[PDB]
Structure 1
Amino acid sequence: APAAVDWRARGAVTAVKDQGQCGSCWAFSAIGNVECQWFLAGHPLTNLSEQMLVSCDKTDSGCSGGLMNNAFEWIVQENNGAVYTEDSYPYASGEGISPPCTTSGHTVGATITGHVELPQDEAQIAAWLAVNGPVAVAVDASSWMTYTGGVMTSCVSEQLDHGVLLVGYNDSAAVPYWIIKNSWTTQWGEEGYIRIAKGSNQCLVKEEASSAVVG
């Protein structure tokens, strides 16, 4: 494998977004994965709709949590594989209240056929990401409010609570690390990203990694 991969620095990741005061992390995670995979499948890099998931994905709980695997399944099984653009279905849940689902006025920007869940194995997760692009992952982000920059080694790792986007890794550094896109604006962390140590299941990053599949 390449000693270091960074799909953001290659230009395959959209800008860091703002989930606001809403428990929508799962939506931003999943949509960010679909954005990258869509571009990597031979389509333009598009901003896609978290709000579609927040308002209409009734297998999840909108501003009160969800699973990226649930959201991928809902897209295929309930929304005919379609993902709307961010512009046609814009985020409106930044204050904690999601508007009702609307079934008109929205425009497709990407389609997916399914999803792959990845082995609970950091090494195999790295090997997958190096070839197939960024990965949606769940983490223990309880220590992350106090994150300021640098390779976080003190990820208190007791419970999954957050959904984020694994965009790369760097094995050549003194302490190898993952590179994670967050959804808390660029004023948090390293212009919206965070680095956690790689190889000791920091933040329980191995436990629920997955990715959409563009047929």
Structure 2
Amino acid sequence: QMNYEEVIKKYRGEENFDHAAYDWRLHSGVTPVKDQKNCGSCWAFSSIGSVESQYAIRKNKLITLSEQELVDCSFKNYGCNGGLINNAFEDMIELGGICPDGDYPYVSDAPNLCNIDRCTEKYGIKNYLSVPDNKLKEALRFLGPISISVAVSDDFAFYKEGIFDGECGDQLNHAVMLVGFGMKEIVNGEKHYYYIIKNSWGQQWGERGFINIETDESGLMRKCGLGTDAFIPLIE
């Protein structure tokens, strides 16, 4: 399954890198948010996001791929009744690529039947690695956006702009992407550090789909278990 410490060194080597801000959105590494509507398929969106990013980052190609197919075909998961990020990545490999949603469009909880050969060209992930929770900003900076868990709550839903510092979920309950991190200074001077999350609740939600959760310079601070689970697909 490839351990992180051997993967990380091939893509970093050295730098040294800045822990204040890096935003993939701004450097052609995050494809637009989507909306899972009603249909418990975050795991599907969180997973396929990270792969869309890698095709963006590591080979130019903008491609958006079908989380429906993944909802229809990932038998290590439970379609709209839930799923897991890893399981998803594995199911992708067994399926041997995913269709570009443009061919295999999303119909949320509307009953649908898997159809592998619904698109001549598929899009694969070679393998996937876990990112350790103590090394997220490091991972983002060199490896790319990260499919990750988080304990979402009501306060989290009413987010609209700025740095979230509200209340947290009961348990890890939702999937999202990490796409970056940043820091703004606001004088009461006080440097305020945050991670940028991409969500799957439509662009109407928060900052065109995204949300900024408070953190620290290191990025050891993880609000709402931010990435107690953390995976990134390798397509290289």
TM-score by length of 1: 0.92
* Matching residue within 134, 142, 154 for 1:131: 142
- Structure 1 vs Structure 2 CA RMSD: 1.5
- Whether the aligned pair in 1 keeps the contact of 2:46 and 2:177 (CA below 8 Å) is yes
2:195 aligned with 1:178: yes
2:60 aligned with 1:47: no
1:31 is matched with which residue? 48
1:85 is matched with which residue? 100
Report the Cα offset of residue 43 of structure 1: 4.1
2:228 is matched with which residue? 207
- Whether the aligned pair in 1 keeps the contact of 2:127 and 2:233 (CA below 8 Å) is yes
Q: Deviations over 1:62-103 (max 9, x none)?
A: 111111111001111x212x121111111112xx23402123
The unaligned stretches of length 5 or more in structure 1 are none
2:207 aligned with 1:195: no
2:59 and 2:211 map into 1 onto residues whose CA distance is: 28
Q: Pick the structure with greater CA Rg.
A: 2
Q: Deviations over 1:136-173 (max 9, x none)?
A: 11111113222122211124143111111110001454
Aligned-residue sequence identity (percent) comes to: 39
Change (3 A) 1:98 1:31: farther
Q: Deviations over 1:7-58 (max 9, x none)?
A: 0111221111111101011111111000001222214011111011100001
TM-score by length of 2: 0.84
Listed as ranges, the matches of 1:101-180 within 5 Å are 101-121=114-134, 124-142=135-153, 143-171=155-183, 173=185, 174-180=191-197
- Whether the aligned pair in 2 keeps the contact of 1:136 and 1:163 (CA below 8 Å) is yes
The unaligned stretches of length 5 or more in structure 2 are 1-16, 186-190
2:130 and 2:51 map into 1 onto residues whose CA distance is: 14
